[PDB]
Design a protein around this nucleic acid. Structure first.
Ligand SMILES: Nc1ncnc2c1ncn2[C@@H]1O[C@H](COP(=O)(O)OP(=O)(O)OP(=O)(O)O)[C@@H](O)[C@H]1O
Ligand SMILES: Nc1ncnc2c1ncn2[C@@H]1O[C@H](COP(=O)(O)OP(=O)(O)OP(=O)(O)O)[C@@H](O)[C@H]1O
Ligand SMILES: [Mn+2]
Ligand SMILES: [Mn+2]
Ligand SMILES: [Mn+2]
Ligand SMILES: [Mn+2]
Ligand SMILES: [Zn+2]
Ligand SMILES: [Zn+2]
Lengths: 356, 337
DNA sequence: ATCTGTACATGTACAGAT
DNA sequence: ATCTGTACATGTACAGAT
DNA sequence: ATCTGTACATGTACAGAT
DNA sequence: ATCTGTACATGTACAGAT
């Protein structure tokens, strides 16, 4: 009852969805078209909608959309970047529209993301129907973000991705541990899907950065979010309804509200809570451990789990086990302790940040 | 005990599987070579008990579709039968006559089988009522192969199936929609009549049969759904072996009955291996109810009654009920031979 | 005359709305 | 409960290119 | 267009642990 | 008797090379 009314707050409205989806699809269509025209290096690029809005876990308002422009790159080998698991150099044996981005065998991420961005910037200029601009480039972002004033503000991340259809890299062998939850045939099929590489695009000044790519599994996460039960009928019209997505929404909201207020929490992002809950879904595979009548227990055990990840400084990538999103090298212990105390406070005081 | 012991008997042996399959693959590989003639573009889809892992006793009967992609055919229902259709609009020299198409198809097989000199393999006399060209093979052991000619249509499933495949509370709506996006097939049966085939859909179900995704997987629990199919298949095989009065029954009847039971009883825990006996017994009970009411509807085509008087005589159904009721109430003597 | 990328046409799970 | 807009998977048509 | 290569599902088999 | 783990065998989906 307490949290059922928070979810009612977080529920998107069909009117806002229509209006936001109407505009967003128009801009994305045009951008996809221009990509195909002339002698564009990105001809052949294909579209994949990913992220919260397409998983039906986008909360509060349909105001941020993530879409991937994926380019199939054949004949490709990969140099893992310093045993980090998630970052790679892309190389080419053979000797190609991507020639202008080559740097002798190795493919440049920033060169390719700059040209990409240039094309988007230009194509946005020729849009007089709607109020749309390109956000200033952010470090670490593989995206070209559109800022739309549809009266209301709307972000769109155009994510540039390489597509490889070969078997996933060995750093993911022990990843995606869904055998006791979605099972082994689901895991095999998912791992027959392509894998994706997005530009790391850091500006830390370290070697290789600028030619460093990062693995992406947004497509697999989209599948998992919309096929999340041990029973095939979970949340279907002739099935029982679980509270897995509702729990993700509340956790997302906790982090969003806190992040709006305290900039100490800049290190953190919603992908953290997304990863923590994929683990909880593996830990607690049965649909009967996400009964909507136990919403509070379920939300509380997800918080308990997240608290332990913050304290023990460990939150493994769901797809790349050896990569720790809560490593010291990524977030201070101070930043983690600060969030740990803020979560315990909300936890033991009636969640007053939900009423803001 | 009894039933575990019987299941041990019916279990195929790795060695016999290895021997039969390599010989069977040789003939199908060679036959499918030849076909791509008017059947160029024919693709091989393996079907039936052996490929569903419910073949019992011996690997001695294999089923194969040679399906043919055929575009924008008009379909027309046969006097409201449900499952039989006339087909209208390379294959020009055949309304598409199933009889005609089958015969040339047959002619090719026959011709090519005559060229095989490394395997003892002949073509069985044509059986009226069979859409199959059947091969009889001798390794030192007898093995028969059904080469099934199918048309493949990539459009919506016909209207008579709209209420079919009632898997919604079992395998669910997403599975049902994806299955119905697969193509549907048409198979020869009056001379130009074809029949719908869903062997491809039945193969997926047999191998994705649980309400939980992990059913019968390495990180899941075993159910006894396939063992019940095997036991019921065995009971009918042994009865037909002995009673010519049961000539009109076939294993597909048993298969159809258990699909209904799997829909009636969707939860994996209703098919617990610790409950093999009751599960078997309630399958027997359901099958007798089908006999008693003369009603066993095609799982994909609900109006089509496989147990109508028109196809199986009232006498034959009561004869099979008497014999099953007997074996049921006597501890299955027939399982002992 | 044919071929074929692009995009209309069809159907339905999901979840908001009445 | 039923009605219903969006997203998305797959089947097909046809303008414009061959 | 056709075929090999790869991965892992579905089986059977058999011994050592329960 | 049943269960676990390893070995052994076939089927099948699809990347990619020719
Ligand atoms: N740090 C990251 N590492 C790996 N994948 C990430 C990371 N950040 C985002 N992604 C992927 O990109 C998608 C879009 O990210 P985004 O930050 O918009 O979050 P979201 O999941 O869409 O939710 P919301 O935008 O409502 O916070 C994520 O769903 C995830 O699949
Ligand atoms: N009357 C029928 N109607 C529809 N499909 C049928 C019919 N008879 C057989 N089939 C299809 O052809 C397949 C092969 O049939 P067949 O007679 O070989 O039985 P089976 O299921 O393979 O089992 P087994 O040979 O072990 O008894 C079946 O599995 C089914 O898909
Ligand atoms: Mn998002
Ligand atoms: Mn984003
Ligand atoms: Mn068979
Ligand atoms: Mn057969
Ligand atoms: Zn659910
Ligand atoms: Zn099972």
């Amino acid at each position: 009852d307490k949290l059922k009314k928070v979810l009612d707050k977080l529920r998107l409205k069909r009117k806002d969805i229509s209006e936001a989806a109407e505009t967003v699809n128009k801009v994305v269509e045009r951008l996809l078209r221009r990509m195909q025209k002339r002698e564009s290096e990105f001809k052949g690029v294909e579209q994949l909608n990913t992220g919260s809005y397409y998983e039906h876990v986008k909360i509060s308002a349909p105001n941020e959309f993530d879409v991937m422009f994926k380019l199939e790159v054949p004949r490709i080998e990969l140099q893992e970047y310093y045993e980090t698991g998630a970052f790679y150099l892309v190389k080419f044996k053979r000797i190609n529209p991507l020639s202008h981005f080559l740097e002798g065998e190795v493919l440049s991420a920033t060169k390719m993301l700059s040209k990409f961005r240039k094309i988007i910037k230009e194509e946005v200029k020729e849009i007089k129907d709607i109020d749309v601009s390109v956000e200033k480039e952010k470090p670490g972002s593989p995206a070209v973000t559109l800022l739309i004033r549809n009266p209301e503000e709307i972000s769109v991340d155009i994510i540039l991705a390489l597509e490889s259809k070969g078997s996933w890299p060995i750093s993911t062998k022990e990843g995606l541990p869904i055998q006791g939850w979605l099972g082994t045939k689901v895991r095999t099929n998912l791992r027959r899907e392509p894998f994706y590489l997005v530009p790391k695009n850091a500006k830390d000044g370290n070697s290789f950065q600028g030619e460093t790519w990062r693995l992406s599994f947004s497509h697999t996460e989209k599948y998992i979010l919309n096929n999340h039960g041990i029973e095939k009928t979970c949340c279907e019209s002739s099935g029982a309804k679980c509270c897995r997505k509702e729990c993700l929404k509340l956790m997302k909201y906790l982090l969003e509200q806190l992040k709006k207020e305290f900039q100490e929490l800049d290190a953190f992002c919603s992908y953290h809570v997304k990863t923590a809950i994929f683990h909880m879904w593996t830990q607690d595979p049965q649909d009967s451990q996400w009964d909507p009548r136990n919403l509070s227990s379920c939300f509380d055990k997800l918080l308990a789990f997240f608290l332990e990840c913050l304290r023990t400084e460990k939150l493994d990538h769901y797809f790349i086990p050896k990569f720790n999103l809560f490593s010291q090298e990524l977030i201070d212990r101070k930043s983690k302790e600060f969030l740990s105390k803020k979560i315990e406070y909300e936890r033991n005081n009636g969640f007053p940040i939900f009423d803001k």
